[PDB]
Design a protein around this ligand. Sequence first.
Ligand SMILES: CCCCCCCCCCCCCCCCCC(=O)OC[C@H](COP(=O)([O-])OCC(O)COP(=O)([O-])OC[C@@H](COC(=O)CCCCCCCCCCCCCCCCC)OC(=O)CCCCCCCCCCCCCCCCC)OC(=O)CCCCCCCCCCCCCCCCC
Ligand SMILES: CCCCCCCCCCCCCCCCCC(=O)OC[C@H](COP(=O)([O-])OCC(O)COP(=O)([O-])OC[C@@H](COC(=O)CCCCCCCCCCCCCCCCC)OC(=O)CCCCCCCCCCCCCCCCC)OC(=O)CCCCCCCCCCCCCCCCC
Ligand SMILES: CCCCCCCCCCCCCCCCCC(=O)OC[C@H](COP(=O)([O-])OCC(O)COP(=O)([O-])OC[C@@H](COC(=O)CCCCCCCCCCCCCCCCC)OC(=O)CCCCCCCCCCCCCCCCC)OC(=O)CCCCCCCCCCCCCCCCC
Ligand SMILES: CCCCCCCCCCCCCCCCCC(=O)OC[C@H](COP(=O)([O-])OCC(O)COP(=O)([O-])OC[C@@H](COC(=O)CCCCCCCCCCCCCCCCC)OC(=O)CCCCCCCCCCCCCCCCC)OC(=O)CCCCCCCCCCCCCCCCC
Ligand SMILES: CCCCCCCCCCCCCCCCCC(=O)OC[C@H](COP(=O)([O-])OCC(O)COP(=O)([O-])OC[C@@H](COC(=O)CCCCCCCCCCCCCCCCC)OC(=O)CCCCCCCCCCCCCCCCC)OC(=O)CCCCCCCCCCCCCCCCC
Ligand SMILES: CCCCCCCCCCCCCCCCCC(=O)OC[C@H](COP(=O)([O-])OCC[N+](C)(C)C)OC(=O)CCCCCCCCCCCCCCCCC
Ligand SMILES: CCCCCCCCCCCCCCCC(=O)OC[C@H](COP(=O)(O)O)OC(=O)CCCCCCCCCCCCCCC
Ligand SMILES: [K+]
Lengths: 49, 88, 212, 113, 77, 127, 98, 202
Amino acid sequence: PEDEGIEQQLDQQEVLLSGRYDPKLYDFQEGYTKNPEDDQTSLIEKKAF
Amino acid sequence: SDPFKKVERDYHNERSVHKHFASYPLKFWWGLNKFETIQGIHSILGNAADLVVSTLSFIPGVQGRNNASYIENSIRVTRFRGFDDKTQ
Amino acid sequence: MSALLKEILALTVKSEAALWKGAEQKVLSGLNNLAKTELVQITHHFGVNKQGSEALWSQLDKAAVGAFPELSVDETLQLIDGFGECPDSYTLSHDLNQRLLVSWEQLGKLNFQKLKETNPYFASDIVNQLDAAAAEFIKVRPAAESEAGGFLNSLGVSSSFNTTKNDIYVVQSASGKKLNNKEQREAYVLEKAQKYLKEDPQSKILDIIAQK
Amino acid sequence: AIRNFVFKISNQIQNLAAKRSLAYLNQIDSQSVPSRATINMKDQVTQMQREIDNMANVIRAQIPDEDRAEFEILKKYYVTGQHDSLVDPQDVLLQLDRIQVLKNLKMIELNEE
Amino acid sequence: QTNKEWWNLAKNIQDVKCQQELNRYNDLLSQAYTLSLDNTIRNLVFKAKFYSWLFVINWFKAFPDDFHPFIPGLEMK
Amino acid sequence: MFLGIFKDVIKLLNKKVVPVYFWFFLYCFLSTMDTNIFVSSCSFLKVEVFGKDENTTLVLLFYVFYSLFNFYLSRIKNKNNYLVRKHLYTTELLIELILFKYKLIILKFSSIKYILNFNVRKFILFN
Amino acid sequence: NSGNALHSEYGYLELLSNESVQLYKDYYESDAEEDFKVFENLSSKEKLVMIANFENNLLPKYDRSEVHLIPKRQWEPAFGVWENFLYDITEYASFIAP
Amino acid sequence: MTALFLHILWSISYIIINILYIFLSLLLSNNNEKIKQYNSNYFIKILLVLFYNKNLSFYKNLLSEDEISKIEFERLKNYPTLVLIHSNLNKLEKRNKIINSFINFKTKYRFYKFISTNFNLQTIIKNCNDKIIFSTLLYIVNLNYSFFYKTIKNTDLIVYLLANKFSILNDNIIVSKFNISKFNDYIKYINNTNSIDTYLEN
Ligand SMILES: CCCCCCCCCCCCCCCCCC(=O)OC[C@H](COP(=O)([O-])OCC(O)COP(=O)([O-])OC[C@@H](COC(=O)CCCCCCCCCCCCCCCCC)OC(=O)CCCCCCCCCCCCCCCCC)OC(=O)CCCCCCCCCCCCCCCCC
Ligand SMILES: CCCCCCCCCCCCCCCCCC(=O)OC[C@H](COP(=O)([O-])OCC(O)COP(=O)([O-])OC[C@@H](COC(=O)CCCCCCCCCCCCCCCCC)OC(=O)CCCCCCCCCCCCCCCCC)OC(=O)CCCCCCCCCCCCCCCCC
Ligand SMILES: CCCCCCCCCCCCCCCCCC(=O)OC[C@H](COP(=O)([O-])OCC(O)COP(=O)([O-])OC[C@@H](COC(=O)CCCCCCCCCCCCCCCCC)OC(=O)CCCCCCCCCCCCCCCCC)OC(=O)CCCCCCCCCCCCCCCCC
Ligand SMILES: CCCCCCCCCCCCCCCCCC(=O)OC[C@H](COP(=O)([O-])OCC(O)COP(=O)([O-])OC[C@@H](COC(=O)CCCCCCCCCCCCCCCCC)OC(=O)CCCCCCCCCCCCCCCCC)OC(=O)CCCCCCCCCCCCCCCCC
Ligand SMILES: CCCCCCCCCCCCCCCCCC(=O)OC[C@H](COP(=O)([O-])OCC(O)COP(=O)([O-])OC[C@@H](COC(=O)CCCCCCCCCCCCCCCCC)OC(=O)CCCCCCCCCCCCCCCCC)OC(=O)CCCCCCCCCCCCCCCCC
Ligand SMILES: CCCCCCCCCCCCCCCCCC(=O)OC[C@H](COP(=O)([O-])OCC[N+](C)(C)C)OC(=O)CCCCCCCCCCCCCCCCC
Ligand SMILES: CCCCCCCCCCCCCCCC(=O)OC[C@H](COP(=O)(O)O)OC(=O)CCCCCCCCCCCCCCC
Ligand SMILES: [K+]
């Protein structure tokens, strides 16, 4: 059937399980700041992320 | 009555006191014409009243406003023009 | 006086035919001797016990009418209760029923006025409770009209108090007990309607419920 | 042709309206944007109602006890009796006058004691 | 680090558990800055300077209503 | 149906919907002071009452008489009976006064800035 | 009939926020570096953040898009342009629209 | 004066519609039976809800009792200003029919006994004699629900109200009335209504 809803769920797993977006490989930072600073988001927002 | 005496000019009468203390608290609302909102309200009421007169003008002895006349438009429009509460 | 009242109390409790006849004769003879308070008490006692000759009750009706102006609220209530639980063959003359009817209405009107003044939300609370489970057509009723006169009634026009009647009633128990469901409420209403119909066969409660 | 096209416009409009009105119930939209907007609206509403109550509480604490009864009557009427037709304002006025009678009596006692 | 006036307002404010909800009361809690002083000429001059400077310094702060470090809130309550 | 419309027009002009006071006001508004029957004949009204730029004495006397009469009527009405529904206009005035009294209390014990912020938020929520 | 939500539609939303927090606890149950006390007494913003990641796993996973048939009113030549137009208008407001 | 302004504009609209109604009737089939067939139309109902009153000849005999009641119900439910206009027009009826009740003391007391036996009046009013509460309740009903006396018996109506009120619970209850269409009522309504209480049946 290649259902739209199911395929979207499958491709999401394929992208996330690809290993290219592993949080271990990234040093999250604000970016917009002049100086390099780590993520400043709230504790709940980090858990939600 | 005798309006002729009132018409008659008199040195004392002209320079006498015409407006007394009691009239000030009763006539101070006329200063609200300064506000644009009050001017807008009065213009709307005047326009509404003119419309009623025009619709009821069919009866004899009652004539509504005619937009052609310049005097009627000028007086109705320039009533609040240049209003200044500071200058007597 | 006190002994006679106690004797009437004892005889009424015994509920013996001869004792009732003896009490009826004694009270009938001593109606004038007894004061208003005693007359009211014996009338109340006879009514609750469901006994008394027609002649005795008829003379009690005359006594109550004559001494009605000197009655207090408690005296009026006792007379109403006694004349309510009176023997069936006691068709009263058309002076006491009017007095009882007028007195009862006045007591209700005065009580309503006193309660409303003490708490202005008294009337509103009752009306909301009555209309909480009422049918839609019941809520459709108009609003109260101003009966006051003056410029607004003679030379002016007074706008009516009616407004949109699309409201939602949220009922919450003050104590916190669980409330009845729709099926339970329908059963409760149906049971009450059946009881009222049995008492009064001509009642149209069935149609009223069936309407909505 | 024309009739079908008109319906197609109607179909898209009706879908748009249904989404715009009831999108907070489902999770079709990622991150539940409409659901969080609806929750925010209720939180603002409840906070505003609670803020009015808190403002009354602080005034109630600071109000002198002599006129605290009057404040209660005014507070209760402003919340409930204002929007109820069955609540006659005359009775509320009568309560205020009864309080004023007691104040007048106290005032006159002090003047002529 | 607060005063009695703020505590009186804070205790009266009840049933609030969120900082965002309490921030809605920031203006009410600002009344705690009584800054009581007489209106003598010297004080009147000081008031004009102090409040004008207070307006300018707040401009350089440019903090939003959300972040109010000098207005005590839920944590102290 | 022409009769039906005529009856409807009469009903729509009925006293209970269009006050006679409105008609009297309309007649005065449309007619001049010399054509108005109610005042053209009466020289006192046309000169002594409405003809003076300042009639404080007569105005004061009229107000005093009206005040005493209405105070007497209100006292008599209250003494006789009070469980009578009052007019909507009078009820609304009393409601506004009670609300105004409460609003003064809020303003007295609350800051202007807090009032402005609260009202702005309430208006935004309403929109 | 309106964009506002009713009372029965808010209890469901409250459960979603509670469910989202519980879902996080269940998944990260076996993680030492996790303190669940922070989830007690969340702020309004914090609750909204959790609601964002809420997921309902009992819903069907297939697309719910489908086609529904609404029978039409064939043009009636016996009536005319205006009469048919009025018939279409009333039909649309009475049957097709609802 | 606002009500007068609304009434006059409504009156002008009403007259214009009737003139159109007459012109259409004379031009078209001109049969009342044919006209009555469209009273269920979507737009015709709106027109009736907009310009129908019992004191006017518009659709005087073209509507049945059920149709008239529905039109009145719809207007009273979702049309604030129209209700204001039509409520004012209803003053022209001047019915002012006041009718007493419970003429006979025997019947009145018997009705009181039935209510007392089948219901607990202490819930409605606290710390008051049952007879006084009964008299007070009758006065309340007469002031409020006397409109139905034209068709509904007073005793039946009182029993129906009592039965429904006690159906919810045989104990003191608190009732809150809200009009969700209004902003202030809606905010209070959602604030006061809690899902936990509804689930617990409180
Ligand atoms: C239920 C009831 C029953 C009752 C029963 C009983 C009844 C009894 C009988 C009673 C009868 C009563 C009848 C009478 C009642 C009605 C009276 C009436 O009509 O009055 C309304 C009257 C009507 O106004 P108007 O004169 O017709 O308006 C003119 C038009 O605007 C014309 O304006 P303009 O274009 O010619 O020039 C100004 C220009 C606007 O251009 C400007 O910006 C003007 C700036 C001027 C200088 C500002 C200096 C500010 C610094 C401080 C002061 C410095 C000293 C010098 C001050 C000079 C005076 C300004 O205006 C605009 O075009 C604006 C757009 C208009 C639409 C928006 C309307 C908004 C409100 C109007 C005021 C707006 C002010 C904005 C200011 C700027 C904000 C960025 O309204 C006002 O008085 C204004 C609004 C109310 C203001 C309240 C202020 C309270 C104090 C605030 C203190 C804290 C803040 C102070 C700082 C300022 C804010 C930052
Ligand atoms: C007629 C000429 C008109 C034109 C010229 C006008 C004047 C020049 C322009 C000045 C403009 C800038 C303002 C400068 C003055 C500021 C003073 C100030 O802030 O004092 C704060 C002082 C302390 O207030 P707070 O700290 O907030 O708390 C006080 C509580 O009461 C708590 O207090 P407490 O319960 O503990 O009791 C103590 C309280 C007790 O206070 C009372 O209420 C007691 C009242 C006793 C009788 C008052 C009359 C006697 C004093 C007259 C003033 C001096 C002569 C003025 C005329 C000069 C030309 C001939 O005493 C005080 O706290 C200290 C009061 C001393 C300050 C006022 C004295 C100076 C005012 C005159 C202007 C200064 C420049 C004059 C230059 C020429 C001569 C050197 O507040 C006041 O008392 C202010 C009251 C209102 C003042 C209005 C303006 C002065 C009027 C004077 C009478 C003139 C005749 C009336 C017609 C005027 C034309 C419409
Ligand atoms: C109307 C008649 C005339 C005026 C009458 C008098 C005034 C009446 C109305 C106002 C009455 C209230 C008076 C103020 C009472 C005190 C308020 C208060 O508690 O505020 C204190 C405020 C507390 O707030 P917060 O905790 O920061 O929370 C911030 C939130 O934003 C919360 O912020 P907020 O909302 O609380 O903000 C406070 C703001 C509240 O007040 C206001 O917002 C002002 C309201 C009135 C003025 C409105 C003007 C609006 C303008 C736009 C409209 C159009 C105007 C058109 C003009 C045309 C003609 C020019 O306070 C003020 O600034 C009061 C100023 C009062 C004077 C007003 C006149 C100023 C005239 C200036 C003229 C221009 C300059 C000179 C001339 C230039 C050209 C030659 O700050 C302090 O406690 C200060 C502490 C001192 C140390 C500061 C250190 C800063 C540097 C370090 C930062 C980093 C911190 C460390 C790290 C982080 C933490 C670990
Ligand atoms: C630049 C200017 C500034 C403004 C901006 C620009 C504005 C542009 C607007 C353009 C609008 C375009 C409209 C096109 C519609 C096409 C309809 C269609 O599908 O055609 C086929 C349709 C074919 O008919 P059918 O559907 O098969 O039915 C025929 C069956 O044989 C017969 O079927 P049945 O017998 O079974 O039943 C139907 C029969 C049943 O009988 C009826 O129901 C007859 C009713 C007659 C009217 C009764 C009221 C009398 C009082 C006067 C009007 C007051 C207004 C209230 C109207 C109430 C509703 C009628 O009725 C008929 O015969 C229907 C046709 C009626 C035509 C005669 C009336 C035309 C004039 C209407 C009033 C116009 C407004 C005047 C405003 C005041 C001017 C001083 O064509 C027609 O037969 C009628 C076509 C009409 C075209 C109108 C074009 C007007 C363009 C100029 C507009 C400006 C007017 C002046 C005002 C200026 C203001 C600024
Ligand atoms: C626009 C059309 C004009 C056409 C002119 C044609 C010439 C003849 C006109 C006929 C009307 C006047 C004479 C007869 C009146 C009969 C009154 C009567 O017995 O009714 C009992 C009526 C019974 O009340 P209700 O029905 O139970 O309703 C209760 C509501 O509470 C009561 O209120 P409501 O909601 O029912 O509506 C009235 C509401 C006002 O309603 C309106 O807006 C009226 C709108 C116009 C109505 C037009 C109706 C007449 C139409 C005739 C023309 C038909 C022509 C037909 C032919 C075809 C035309 C195409 O009036 C008030 O209560 C206002 C009081 C406060 C003063 C407001 C003005 C100052 C502003 C103050 C602001 C304060 C804010 C706070 C402080 C601010 C500080 C900065 O009693 C009153 O409403 C008493 C009103 C007392 C105040 C009136 C005077 C104040 C100004 C009124 C508004 C402006 C209009 C003034 C006249 C304009 C003439 C050009
Ligand atoms: C035609 C007339 C036009 C008049 C326009 C005048 C505009 C004047 C504008 C001055 C702005 C000054 C800003 C700096 C801060 C001032 C102090 C301050 O913040 O106030 C609060 C301060 C602080 O008072 P507070 O401490 O009670 O504050 C209460 C608030 N809490 C509780 C938070 C503290 O108030 C005062 O000290 C008194 C202010 C009023 C003083 C009046 C003096 C006389 C004025 C005469 C008229 C104006 C001058 C002449 C104009 C001539 C024009 C031709
Ligand atoms: C003994 C009673 C004699 C009169 C009996 C019939 C009177 C009927 C008419 C009422 C009086 C109208 C006077 C109009 C002319 C006039 O006033 O003339 C004096 C001035 C004229 O104003 P202008 O100079 O702007 O033309 O009036 C005013 O300043 C306004 C006063 C109010 C006038 C209208 C009446 C309002 C209600 C009066 C009671 C409320 C308090 C009044 C102040 C104490
Ligand atoms: K919705």
